[PDB]
Design an enzyme around this catalytic site. Structure first.
Site, short mmCIF file in Angstrom:
data_model
loop_
_atom_site.label_atom_id
_atom_site.label_comp_id
_atom_site.label_asym_id
_atom_site.label_seq_id
_atom_site.Cartn_x
_atom_site.Cartn_y
_atom_site.Cartn_z
N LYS A 1 0.84 -1.19 0.00
CA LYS A 1 0.00 0.00 0.00
C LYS A 1 0.88 1.25 0.00
CE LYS A 1 -4.05 1.86 2.40
NZ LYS A 1 -5.10 1.41 3.35
N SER B 1 -9.77 1.19 2.22
CA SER B 1 -8.79 2.03 1.55
C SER B 1 -7.54 1.31 0.99
CB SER B 1 -8.32 3.11 2.53
OG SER B 1 -7.52 2.54 3.54
N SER B 2 -7.42 -0.01 1.18
CA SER B 2 -6.37 -0.79 0.50
C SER B 2 -6.84 -1.18 -0.91
CB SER B 2 -6.01 -2.03 1.31
OG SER B 2 -5.56 -1.72 2.61
N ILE C 1 -8.33 0.36 9.49
CA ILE C 1 -9.29 0.98 10.38
C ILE C 1 -10.59 0.90 9.60
CG2 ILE C 1 -9.62 3.45 9.84
CD1 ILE C 1 -8.42 4.13 12.55
N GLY C 2 -11.69 0.68 10.29
CA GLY C 2 -12.96 0.70 9.59
C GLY C 2 -13.31 -0.40 8.60
N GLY C 3 -12.31 -1.14 8.10
CA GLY C 3 -12.58 -2.20 7.13
C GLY C 3 -11.59 -2.32 5.99
N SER C 4 -10.51 -1.53 6.01
CA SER C 4 -9.76 -1.27 4.79
C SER C 4 -8.87 -2.44 4.35
CB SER C 4 -8.92 0.00 4.93
OG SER C 4 -9.73 1.11 5.30
#
Lengths: 571, 569
Positions: free
Chosen positions: B156, B231-232, B252-255
């Protein structure tokens, strides 16, 4: 020129805390009942006629530990029981050589004496303790084995931890009506492992003194010199363990509240890395506070006992099963190293506050003993201690003292001297926003890496340093936490251990070179000008051994080698 | 219901300025866009069957195209459809050379980027020379440099890479050039890995999607109409397509879990503080309430296992990152399905899941029951509180850091950036006492779910990763199925089920049409579902374990993926 503590009190005006009319009408009666209940709980057969009134014994720097042995206040059997390590007490009970009842009665007797001299208890329940010890022996009969590795071991408990069906106030008068329905996590693990409970020990108002002053029971005194403080905020733990009134004590440590009472009062104490021992279930102003998290841990009169407690608590108590914050990282089995295998970095002076003659002498004697046994020593000038001190003291108060003020103003109880002191620690009543709290976190992480990189890159095993810039302070006269608070912001596991050295008034005095010292700060002057050889006689010197994060096991293993090298036998 | 309804928390008036951005910054972006084009190896490229815009509108399946048009030689296909575990064995045996393994993946990575736009930086030439040094070392010494010797790994972009731009998706950081690798990429280098591509991510790193002002949108390799997630974003696309053996993202959050689930691969969100996050660009400096996590993504669970074991026990992150725990990666055997107790979340109480997710979850449950596992239907408590608490944590600095990084360039705000800047109380800057109350709530929630699992002897929780399959670009709003496990910080495996959306099945039933929406957000999400505009999207699900039992999560993931017969190669 001489420094008075009031010139530091310019960060919190302290005008929305106290109100003597409301306190006297609504809360003072409940406190008096609490005091009377403690008096009623002292067993008279375990008490004694004092050689002089207690306040004369205080003026005289009475050594209560010496008196206990010289006047033979316990029988030979009680001395034989109460001067065994918890480890060998545990093996003896498990093997049927000692009953739990007889082991309890000795410690119960010795703890009542401890309270009569040091004022270390807030709650006494010897009768309930006796019934617990009886159950232990009943269980051993029926089943032929013990309940667990602490079966029958009498353990003292800091008051602020939830105790089922008993007042838990954490030093706050407003909380004298707080009665939890269950033990906190750590206490209920100790019971399941077999421990026996009977005394809950004193702590200062706000839990943020390296001393004991509170509005319930007053001051707790040092068992080796009754003029001196026994420390804090685990004040009664240091007194009762140092006196031998229990086999192991349990305290908590932000800022130094395990290591300082241990060092002041003549016993050993471990501040573990955060998140190994649970702090869930107690009273304090720290709910939600994560920038410098508090820690709980054991105190005892031998390193074996510290090791027994950690190993049993973690590997058998399994705290992660009831406290999600607690890490499931096993307590590893580690061999005791040879002194010649160790590399030790030495802090002679943290760069903030010069240490007094007894600390300098004891540190120097221990370094030379280590060098003589073959250890590689590194003379270490620790970096950024000023930034570390300022950052952690800002962290203590960056909610603008919101929670401390809420708990204190709920009863309008009068503010103690050292409470005014710690309420003014950082920016006092300034309430930080989230972005500014996060910047303090960034500083903390940079400091942690700087120090971890030092020990990794230089193959350093441990850091040896003072616990405080003096031996035990006079009551309400200890202001600088820099020597302990450094290891709270770094979160390094740190053993406070007795050196076997005691202050000597004929030799622990300032030199002529010392008298031309130029002070770096008002705080350094405040602390150093309090040192007086004739007013700190015979106080024990305890020092700190810090390891890398989560290497607690190695800390205790090396602590065991060092205490044996030094011939320290607190029994 | 429209998304503008929700944008009442940050006025968004001190972020963007078109004239400043155009004059001072856009020239630097265009140079960055042109360096990416030049870096694409022209020999490895293909002639697209239709222009990319028409492929996108036609829900093109680029992965089927890769195999049916045979864009790689038989040999390249044989190399890039081995798991990294087998590749590392064969390289260390001498049966394969690192140069040979690299070129195969460099070729398939180029194709991945051509269809999905997953790359933000390419340096195949530097990657090739790294692969030569691996082969040289193997000849000189007869052994490999470490357990990942010669294994091509995608990174990333936001993680620091020595002497290369690291901007984290902020135009204003197109000037940031670190002098050393981040901690994790430096550990992977020492373990023997080979680097050649850095993958895309959204503006602010806070979308389950990819939109950003450098390269635009990244698309799903199994259906180019759909997002690859975020975001990944580029990791999901490139690993799902097979352009790398293993990918490294953050969550974070699901990324990590969302891009894996959307784009046809597996990913692991580990428990915090095992894998380092030190050395990267984000707005999260000093944020501790919901700590971000890094972790691996791959096309087999054995590869996630390999990555974690090597990283921890051989990389020893605690020696260079004092935050990382010295907690050994434990050796755990694969369980028998009949020995498992699994709690099933079919609805988190907030957003009903779409027909394909509901069908795939039900099929897996019936497979697990049929193989002996004990099944507990689970209504998860306090998910509304957990959702509001974590989204308040996301923004409780009043968006100070996000706004500082965005306004430094005045770059235009993406649609879903506007969305996430309004997540909490948006621009309300909390005081410390309020943030501490969120921490208190977080710890009550953790204890509640920990108590559930301990008291009922539950091994794992099985649940959706999202209330739909992969979303349309810029049309993903609800993070609740992934963000629940960030605030609880439970290790969570995102694993493909082998099941794919089927337009003939996967329509709303008649009773579904009578459903009464619990909230605007639930209506917003559900009405975007249309059987004909999500064709063939893969379904990934989540397996969550108790904190710091990552090893058991993967071992049971090995078992469940084999019971379902899922082979992504």
């Amino acid at each position: 020129m001489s420094v008075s503590y009031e010139t530091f009190l310019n960060k919190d005006p302290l005008d929305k805390y106290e109100d003597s009319e409301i306190y006297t009408k609504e809360w003072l009666p409940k406190v008096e009942k609490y005091r009377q209940d403690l008096k009623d709980a002292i067993p008279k057969n375990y008490t004694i006629e004092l050689p002089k009134p207690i306040d004369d014994l205080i003026k005289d720097q009475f050594n209560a530990v010496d008196y206990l042995y010289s006047q033979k206040l316990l029988t030979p059997e009680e001395f034989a029981i109460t001067d065994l390590s918890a480890t060998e007490l545990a093996k003896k009970i498990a093997a049927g050589e000692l009953s739990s009842v007889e082991v309890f009665k000795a410690f119960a007797h010795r703890a009542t004496l401890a309270h009569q001299f040091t004022n270390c208890a807030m709650e006494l329940f010897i009768d309930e303790g006796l019934k617990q010890a009886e159950e232990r022996d009943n269980y051993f009969k029926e089943h032929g084995k013990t309940v667990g590795p602490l079966h029958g071991i009498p353990i003292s408990l800091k008051e602020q931890m939830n105790y089922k069906d008993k007042i838990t106030h954490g030093g706050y008068v407003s909380k004298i009506v707080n009665i939890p329905n269950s033990h906190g996590v750590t206490t209920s693990i100790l019971e399941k492992l077999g421990a026996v409970f009977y005394v809950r020990t004193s702590q200062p108002q706000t839990l943020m003194h390296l001393d004991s002053a509170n509005n319930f029971t007053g001051l707790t005194k040092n068992p080796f010199n009754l003029l001196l403080s026994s420390g804090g905020s685990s004040s009664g733990e240091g007194a009762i363990v140092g006196y031998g009134g229990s086999a192991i004590g349990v305290g908590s440590d932000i800022g130094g509240s395990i290591r300082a009472p241990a060092a002041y009062s003549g016993c050993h104490g471990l501040r573990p890395t955060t998140k190994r021992i649970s702090v869930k279930g107690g009273v304090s102003s720290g709910a939600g506070q994560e920038s410098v998290p508090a820690v709980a841990g054991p105190m005892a009169r031998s390193i074996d006992d510290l090791e027994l407690w950690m190993k049993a608590y973690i590997n058998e108590g399994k705290p992660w099963e009831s406290d999600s914050t607690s890490l499931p990282m096993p307590w590893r089995d580690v061999s005791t190293p040879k002194i010649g295998d160790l590399t030790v970095a030495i802090i002679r002076d943290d760069g903030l506050v010069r240490v007094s003659p007894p600390i300098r002498r004891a540190l120097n004697t221990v370094v030379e003993k280590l060098k003589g046994a073959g250890a590689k020593i590194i003379e270490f000038d620790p970096p950024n201690t000023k930034l570390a001190y300022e950052t952690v003291h800002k962290m203590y108060n960056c909610d603008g003292n919101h929670m401390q003020r809420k708990l204190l103003s709920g009863s309008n109880e009068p503010l103690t001297k050292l409470t005014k002191w710690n309420l003014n620690y950082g920016e006092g009543a300034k309430h930080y926003d989230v972005a500014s709290n996060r910047e303090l976190n960034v500083t903390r992480d940079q400091l942690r890496d700087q120090y971890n990189d030092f020990m990794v890159q230089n193959k350093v095993d441990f850091i040896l340093s003072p616990t405080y810039n003096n031996v035990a302070p006079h009551s309400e006269e200890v202001y600088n936490w820099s020597y302990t608070s450094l290891w709270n912001i770094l979160d390094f596991p740190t053993l406070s251990f007795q050196t076997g050295i005691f202050q000597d008034p004929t030799k622990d005095k300032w030199t002529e070179e010392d008298t031309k010292y130029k002070y770096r700060s008002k705080l350094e002057q405040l602390e150093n000008e309090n040192y007086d050889p004739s007013q700190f006689v015979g106080a024990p010197v305890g020092l700190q051994l810090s390891g890398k994060r989560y290497f607690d096991e190695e800390v205790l293993a090396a602590g065991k080698a060092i205490v044996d090298l030094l011939g320290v036998d607190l029994y």
